[PDB]
Structures are given as C-alpha cells and as structure tokens.
Amino acid sequence: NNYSYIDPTQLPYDHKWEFPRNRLSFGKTLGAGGKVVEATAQGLIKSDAAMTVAVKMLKPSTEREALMSELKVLSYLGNHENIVNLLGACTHGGPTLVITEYCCYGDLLNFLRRKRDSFHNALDLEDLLSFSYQVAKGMAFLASKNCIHRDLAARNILLTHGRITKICDFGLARVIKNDSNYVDKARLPVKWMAPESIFNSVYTFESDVWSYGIFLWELFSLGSSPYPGMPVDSKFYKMIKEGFRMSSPEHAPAEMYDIMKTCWDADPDKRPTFKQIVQDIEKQISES
Ligand SMILES: c1ccc(-c2cc3cc(-c4cn[nH]c4)cnc3[nH]2)cc1
Numbered sequence: 001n002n003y004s005y006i007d008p009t010q011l012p013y014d015h016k017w018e019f020p021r022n023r024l025s026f027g028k029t030l031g032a033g034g035k036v037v038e039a040t041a042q043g044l045i046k047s048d049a050a051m052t053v054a055v056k057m058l059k060p061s062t063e064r065e066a067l068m069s070e071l072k073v074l075s076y077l078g079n080h081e082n083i084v085n086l087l088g089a090c091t092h093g094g095p096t097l098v099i100t101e102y103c104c105y106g107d108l109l110n111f112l113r114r115k116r117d118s119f120h121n122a123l124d125l126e127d128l129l130s131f132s133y134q135v136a137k138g139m140a141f142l143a144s145k146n147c148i149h150r151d152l153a154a155r156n157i158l159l160t161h162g163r164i165t166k167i168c169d170f171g172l173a174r175v176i177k178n179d180s181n182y183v184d185k186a187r188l189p190v191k192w193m194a195p196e197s198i199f200n201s202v203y204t205f206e207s208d209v210w211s212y213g214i215f216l217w218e219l220f221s222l223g224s225s226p227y228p229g230m231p232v233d234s235k236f237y238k239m240i241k242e243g244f245r246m247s248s249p250e251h252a253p254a255e256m257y258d259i260m261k262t263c264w265d266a267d268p269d270k271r272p273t274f275k276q277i278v279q280d281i282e283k284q285i286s287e288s
Contacts, residue, residue: 005177007178008076009069009076009175010072014075017086017087018090019043019044019087019088021090021092021094023042024090025039025040026038030054031107034063034067035056035059038052038053038102039099041053044088054099054101055097055098055099056099057098066171069170070170070171071089071098073170073173073175074098074170076145076147081164082134082137082141082166083142084101084103084166085101085166086098087101103168105160106158107157107159108131108154108158108219111159112222112223116222116223125251125253128219129253129281129284129285131157132219133278133285135157135212135215138165139167139209139277140278142173143208143275146175146176147176148173148174148176148205150173150174151169151189152167152192153189153192153211153214153218154215154219156168157215180204181202181203182204183201183203184203185201190232191214191227191232192210192211192226198240204268205274206269207268209263209273210271212274214226214246216252216256217252220250220252221250221251221252222251226246241266243266253284255280259280
C-alpha cells in the first residue's frame with residue numbers, strides 16, 4: 001500500500017543535537033562492547049559551565065549505522081527518567097560521536113557483582129525490587145512509543161546518582177509502528193532472546209518482555225550468568241523449545257519468580273505487558 005506510518009528513526013539526522021568537538025576533552029575509557037569515554041563538555045548549560053558526559057564512539061561497517069540508529073532512536077524517544085539521556089552528537093569533520101548522560105556507577109551487572117557479598121551503601125531486597133520496578137517502567141515507556149530494545153540485559157542498564165536505573169545501548173532498537181513484527185537479517189544475545197526470535201527471527205513487544213524475564217533472573221541472582229555452564233549449542237536450543245526454563249534465583253520473592261515464568265511462556269500472547277508488570281511490582285512493593 002501507498003499509505004505509511006512515518007518512522008521517525010528513518011528520518012534525517014536533526015542537527016539540533018550537533019555539538020562542536022572542540023568543546024569536548026576526552027578522559028578515561030568507560031566501556032567496550034563500541035567504546036564509550038568520559039569527557040567534559042563546554043556550553044551544554046545556559047550559564048555556560050563545563051559538565052561531565054559519556055561519549056560513545058567507534059574504532060576505525062554495520063556498527064557505523066548501529067550508532068546512527070541508536071542516536072535517532074534516542075532523539076525520537078525524548079527524555080525519560082529511566083533511559084540514558086541523549087545530550088548531543090558530533091557528525092561533521094571527524095568520526096561520529098554520541099554524547100549522553102554519565103552514570104557514575106556504570107553498568108548494573110558489575111554493580112550487583114561488586115555488591116554481592118555486601119548484600120543483605122550495601123544492597124538489600126528493596127533495592128532489587130526498585131531495580132525491577134524502574135526497569136519495567138523504562139520498558140513500558142519504550143513500548144508506549146512502539147519501540148523494542150532487543151538487547152535488554154543487566155549489562156545494558158546503568159545505575160546513576162540516587163540508585164536510579166537507566167536503560168542504555170539502543171544499537172539494536174527498532175520502532176515497530178507499521179508492522180506488528182520485526183524480522184532481522186548480526187551477533188546476538190542468544191541467552192536473552194525469545195524462542196521466536198531465535199527460531200523465526202521475529203522481534204515484538206512480547207520478545208522484549210522475555211528478555212525482561214531473563215534480566216530479573218540476573219537481578220535476583222546478583223549478577224549471575226543465565227543458564228549457568230550451558231554453552232550455546234544444539235543441546236541449548238532444544239531445551240528451550242521443549243520448554244525448560246531457569247529455576248528461581250536465590251533471593252527472588254515467589255511473586256517475582258511468577259513474573260519471570262510468565263515472561264518465559266512459549267506463547268508470546270500469554271506473556272504480560274510491561275504495563276501489567278509495573279502494576280504487579282508496585283503492589284508487591286506496597287505490601288511491606
Ligand atoms: C565506573 C565505571 C564506569 C562507569 C560508567 C559506564 C558508563 C556507560 C555509559 C553509557 C552511555 N551510553 N552507553 C553506555 C554512561 N556512563 C557510564 N558510566 C561509571 C563508574
């Protein structure tokens with residue numbers, strides 16, 4: 001048909017975000033997975049002070065576009081408390097850079113790992129509930145803007161001041177207004193992917209929820225690797241398709257495990273929505 005919902009992520013880069021590279025000074029390397037580095041940015045404030053930011057870059061081609069992808073998606077979504085904030089981008093004379101909010105504690109996965117012994121500036125059950133709650137809200141927001149993240153995991157969740165969680169790395173994110181599915185034609189997070197994504201290459205709101213389930217398992221297991229000791233081979237894919245699922249992690253309240261189980265239903269339609277998840281966790285928090 002000749003009649004289309006316009007996808008904002010496919011529109012041209014809006015130079016409202018453009019930022020002079022002269023006004024950036026690169027610090028330490030912050031991650032590699034491209035790479036992000038800490039920097040100070042002049043002129044982002046009305047009073048014209050310097051502020052600390054995180055800049056996402058590439059090394060000297062599909063990752064070239066994945067960065068442009070991530071940028072247009074962030075630009076499209078706008079600002080939310082539970083998403084890494086886009087602050088600007090450099091696209092002129094030089095390599096493409098993406099400036100975003102700096103999260104002082106880094107990824108949630110290594111945070112839970114550092115804090116694993118201190119558990120029970122320590123960690124306790126109420127923090128993990130909060131992380132549950134915030135991440136589901138950030139996800140419910142993406143779903144509200146017809147966006148699927150497609151790489152939901154503890155490694156892609158940053159923790160900032162105030163124990164606030166932010167979703168980051170939108171390289172694989174898509175906007176699914178026109179079609180109810182998304183079919184892909186790269187390297188992928190198998191142990192976080194829904195079956196229909198592995199077997200038929202389809203991605204939907206329901207497949208993000210599946211990833212959210214695996215994330216909870218990461219979360220209540222204090223940063224343990226999914227399907228521990230299980231290599232990604234033929235043995236793995238069968239067990240998935242036959243219906244086998246991880247068991248409850250050590251510190252997961254029974255009703256939080258019930259949420260993982262419904263996120264892992266082979267039937268996408270029997271999975272809950274992020275809207276429903278946010279309601280569930282909110283009631284669990286109240287009863288305390
Ligand atoms: C210690 C070590 C590392 C960090 C840290 C990582 C990180 C990553 C992003 C990021 C932006 N886009 N994608 C990812 C932002 N801030 C960060 N901060 C903080 C304390």
